[PDB]
Design a protein around this ligand. Structure first.
Ligand SMILES: *[C@@H]1O[C@H](CO)[C@@H](O[C@@H]2O[C@H](CO)[C@@H](O)[C@H](O)[C@H]2NC(C)=O)[C@H](O)[C@H]1NC(C)=O
Ligand SMILES: *[C@@H]1O[C@H](CO)[C@@H](O[C@@H]2O[C@H](CO)[C@@H](O)[C@H](O)[C@H]2NC(C)=O)[C@H](O)[C@H]1NC(C)=O
Ligand code: NAG
Lengths: 110, 410, 56, 73
C-alpha cells in the first residue's frame, strides 16, 4: 500500500527566490529525498547548496547527480548531502595507478 | 541619518534597551543614526526573511542586529547567507546569534560577539597551568570546528605537558554504544577534555556513567557551547564540571545593543569620511542582484577596527571579536553554575588560591640556607617544588614561590 | 541523465522499502509555520542509506 | 594424584626454569582459593628468585565488565 507521488520544480535565474520557493514547496510537500540534475547551468557557480542546507536543517538526505566539486564531500558542513558521481580527487588515485603502471615517482603538481 | 534595525525575539527588556539606546556619545561626528526596534518570533527562517525584506524596503536598512534566546546555531548559519547576499551588514550579539559557526562567506558582512576556538583553548590551557595538572586527554565529535581546536592545542603544547590519549567519536552511526564504551577504556589521565554538542554531551555522559569514569577522581572541562544556557541544567552533568562562558552577567543586552549601534555608526562615519562616500544603495528586497552594484569593499575594512573610548571592539577576519571578556563556571553539588574566576588580556585570575576537591597531608617548613632554598617564580622550573607564602597586611593573600634544597630532595 | 535518473530513482525506491521494514516511522513537520524541531530519524535514515547495497 | 599445593610448586618450578620473574595473580570465587593464596605467599618469601608479584586479581561475580575490567586493565 505504499504510494509514490511525484513533484518537481522548474528553473528561475535568481537564487534567493529560487531557494525560498524550493523550501516552501518542499515543506508543504513533506518530501523524503531531493534530486538536482542541472549539469548545464548558464551560471558557472554550480550552487544547489541552499537546498542541501535547508534539508540539513531537518536532517533530510540529499543525493547529488551532476556537480563533482569536493566542497560537497565535506560532511561537517554538508551534514545531509550525498552524490553518486565521484569528485576529481579519484582522478588522483587514477594517476597514482598510472604511476604504478609506468614507474613514476617524482611529479610536478600545479 | 543611517538606518539601523534592531530585532528582538523572546522575552527581553525592550523598554530598557530603548531607553538605553541613546546612551552613546555620537555628537562628535555627523551620523544621527536612525534605529528601529521590532519584535519577532522563532517561527521559521522564511518569516525572518520576510521581516528583514520589509524592514530594508521600508526604512532602507543599512545594518541588522539580531538577538534571541534559543540554543540553535542555525540562526547565524542562515543569517550568513543574508549578510552575503545583501550589501547591508548584519551583527549578532546574544542568544542564538552568538555561537560562532565554521566560517563566514567572502562577501559576508556578519560579525559576532565572542571568542574564537583558539582563544578558548588558550584560556583552558592557562587554567591547567594555574593549578598544576599536566596530564590530560582530548575527545571530540565530528562538529566542523574540531580540527582547529586539536591543532591549536597541539601547537600550543608543542613545562612538562604530557598528552597520552586523543579520541574521535562519530555519533551519526547508531548502535555504537558498546563500541563507545569499549574505546573509552583508553582514557587514563585524571582530566579529560570534550568538544561536542549538548545532546551528544548527554549521550556521552550516559556512556561514562555506564562505565563509571566520572565519579570522584575525574573532572571534565568543556567549551561554551556545551553549557550555553545557565538557567537549564541537563539531567546528569557530573558535579564539578568546569567550563568557560561569555560574560553575560556584567554585560547585559542594552550594553550589547549600544556597542553594536556605536560600531556600526563609527564604521559608517569612517567610510563616509576617509573615502568621503557612504555606500547606501537602493535597499531593494526584490531582485537583490541589481542592488549589489555599489559594493563597499572598504566598509568591512573599516568594520574591523573600532574603539569605543576604552573598549577595543575590533573584529577578526573570520568574523569573531578580538578582545572578548570571559568568565569561568563550576558545577557545585546543587545544579548551578558559580563564578570562580576571570580571564582578560592573557591574564588569569582565580578567586580560590587552591582548587577545592570533590592520602593528602599538608606540610609546613622554613627556609634554611643549604636545605630549603626559596626563590620567585619564572617571570617554577624543573626539579623544584611550588610553595605558597601568605601575606598579611584584607582577604587572605598568597604568593607562589619555588622551593628546593637538600631536605626537599629526600 | 536518462540512465542516471533511472538508477537514482531505483536506488531511492529500494532504500525507502528498506526503511519501511523497520519501526519508528517519522514524517517531517510543516517547517514553514512555527516548526523548528528536527526530524528525529534523520541520522538514523542516513545510516540506513549508508549500508544500502545494490545489483541494478 | 596430587593436591593443589604440589601442583602449585611444580608450576613455580616451571616458571623459574624459564626466568619469567614478573607475574600477577587472578583468582575467582571458586572455593579453595585462599589456601592457594597463602601457599603462594609462603613459597615466594623463602625462594632464591625474588619474584615480582603484581596485586592479586579477585573476581566478585560473573564479571559485569564495569568494575572488573578496571582490575583486568
Ligand atoms: C501529489 O503531488 C502534486 C504535485 O506534484 C500535488 O499537487 C499540488 O497540490 C498543491 C496543494 O493543492 C498545489 O498548491 C500545487 O500547485 C499542486 N501541484 C500540482 C502540479 O498539482 C498533489 O496535491 C499531491 N497529492 C498527494 C497524493 O498528496
Ligand atoms: C587600527 O588601526 C591603527 C592604525 O593602523 C592600528 O595601530 C597600529 O597598530 C600596529 C600594531 O600594533 C602598530 O604596529 C602601528 O604602529 C599602529 N599604528 C598606529 C598609527 O597606531 C591599530 O592597531 C588598529 N587596530 C586594530 C585592532 O585593527
Ligand atoms: C545512456 O544510457 C542509456 C540507458 O542505459 C543507454 O541506452 C544509452 O546508450 C546511453 N548513452 C549513449 C548515447 O550511449
Amino acid at each position: 500500500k505504499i504510494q509514490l507521488n511525484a513533484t518537481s520544480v522548474t528553473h528561475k535565474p535568481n537564487a534567493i527566490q529560487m531557494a525560498l520557493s524550493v523550501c516552501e514547496d518542499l515543506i508543504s510537500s513533506q518530501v523524503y529525498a531531493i534530486l538536482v540534475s542541472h549539469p548545464p547551468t548558464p551560471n558557472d557557480h554550480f550552487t544547489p547548496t541552499p537546498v542541501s542546507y535547508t534539508a540539513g536543517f531537518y536532517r533530510i538526505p540529499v543525493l547529488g547527480l551532476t556537480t563533482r566539486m569536493s566542497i560537497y564531500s565535506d560532511k561537517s558542513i554538508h551534514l545531509s548531502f550525498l552524490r553518486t558521481v565521484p569528485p576529481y580527487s579519484h582522478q588522483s588515485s587514477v594517476w597514482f595507478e598510472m604511476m604504478r603502471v609506468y614507474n613514476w615517482n617524482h611529479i610536478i603538481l600545479l | 541619518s543611517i538606518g539601523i534595525a534592531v530585532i528582538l525575539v523572546g522575552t527581553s527588556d525592550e523598554v530598557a534597551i530603548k531607553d538605553a539606546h541613546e546612551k552613546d556619545d555620537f555628537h562628535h561626528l555627523s551620523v544621527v543614526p536612525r534605529v528601529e526596534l521590532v519584535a519577532m518570533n522563532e517561527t521559521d527562517p522564511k518569516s525572518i526573511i520576510t521581516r528583514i525584506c520589509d524592514l530594508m524596503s521600508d526604512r532602507k536598512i543599512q545594518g541588522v542586529v539580531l538577538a534571541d534566546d534559543t540554543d540553535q546555531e542555525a540562526i547565524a548559519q542562515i543569517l550568513d547567507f543574508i549578510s552575503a547576499q545583501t550589501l547591508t551588514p548584519i551583527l549578532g550579539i546574544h542568544g542564538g546569534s552568538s555561537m560562532i559557526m565554521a566560517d563566514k562567506d567572502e562577501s559576508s558582512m556578519f560579525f559576532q560577539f565572542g571568542p574564537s576556538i583558539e582563544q578558548q583553548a588558550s584560556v583552558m590551557l592557562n587554567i591547567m597551568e594555574e593549578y598544576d595538572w599536566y596530564i590530560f586527554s582530548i575527545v571530540t565529535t565530528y562538529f566542523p570546528g574540531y580540527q582547529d581546536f586539536v591543532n591549536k592545542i597541539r601547537s600550543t603544547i608543542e613545562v612538562g605537558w604530557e598528552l597520552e590519549e586523543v579520541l574521535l567519536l562519530d555519533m551519526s552511526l547508531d548502535d555504537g554504544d558498546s563500541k563507545i564504551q569499549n574505546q573509552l577504556k583508553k582514557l587514563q589521565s585524571p582530566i579529560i577534555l570534550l568538544y561536542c554538542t549538548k545532546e551528544e554531551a548527554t549521550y556521552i555522559f550516559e556512556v561514562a556513567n555506564s562505565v563509571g569514569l566520572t565519579g570522584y577522581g575525574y573532572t571534565w572541562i568543556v567549551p561554551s557551547l556545551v553549557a550555553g544556557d545557565t538557567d537549564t541544567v541537563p539531567s546528569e552533568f557530573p558535579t564539578g564540571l568546569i567550563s568557560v562562558s561569555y560574560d553575560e552577567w556584567d554585560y547585559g543586552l542594552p550594553a550589547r545593543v549600544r556597542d553594536g549601534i556605536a560600531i556600526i555608526t563609527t564604521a559608517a562615519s569612517d567610510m563616509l569620511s576617509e573615502h568621503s562616500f557612504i555606500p547606501e544603495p537602493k535597499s531593494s528586497c526584490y531582485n537583490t542582484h541589481e542592488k549589489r552594484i555599489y559594493q563597499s569593499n572598504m566598509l568591512n575594512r573599516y568594520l574591523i577596527n573600532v574603539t569605543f573610548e576604552g573598549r577595543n571592539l575590533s573584529f577578526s577576519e573570520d568574523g569573531y571579536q578580538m578582545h572578548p571578556k570571559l568568565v569561568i563556571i563550576l558545577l557545585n553539588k546543587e545544579r548551578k553554575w558559580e563564578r570562580v574566576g576571570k580571564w582578560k588580556d592573557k591574564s588569569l585570575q582565580m578567586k580560590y588560591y587552591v582548587w577545592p576537591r570533590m592520602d593528602h597531608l599538608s606540610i609546613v617548613t622554613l627556609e634554611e640556607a643549604p636545605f630549603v632554598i626559596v626563590e620567585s617564580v619564572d617571570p617554577c622550573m624543573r626539579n623544584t617544588v611550588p610553595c605558597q607564602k601568605r601575606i598579611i597586611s584584607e582577604e587572605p593573600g598568597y604568593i607562589k614561590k619555588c622551593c628546593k634544597g637538600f631536605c626537599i630532595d629526600i | 541523465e536518462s540512465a542516471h535518473i533511472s538508477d537514482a530513482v531505483g536506488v531511492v525506491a529500494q532504500a525507502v522499502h528498506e526503511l519501511l521494514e523497520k519501526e519508528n516511522i517519522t514524517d517531517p513537520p510543516r517547517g514553514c509555520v512555527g516548526n523548528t524541531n528536527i526530524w528525529k530519524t534523520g541520522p538514523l535514515f542516513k545510516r540506513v542509506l549508508m549500508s544500502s547495497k545494490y545489483a541494478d | 594424584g596430587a593436591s593443589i599445593q604440589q601442583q602449585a610448586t611444580v608450576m613455580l618450578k616451571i616458571m623459574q626454569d624459564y626466568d619469567w620473574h614478573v607475574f600477577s595473580l587472578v583468582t575467582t570465587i571458586f572455593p579453595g582459593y585462599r589456601d592457594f593464596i597463602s601457599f603462594i605467599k609462603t613459597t615466594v618469601d623463602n625462594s632464591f628468585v625474588g619474584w615480582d608479584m603484581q596485586n592479586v586479581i579477585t573476581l566478585d561475580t560473573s564479571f559485569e565488565d564495569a568494575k572488573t575490567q578496571v582490575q583486568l586493565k
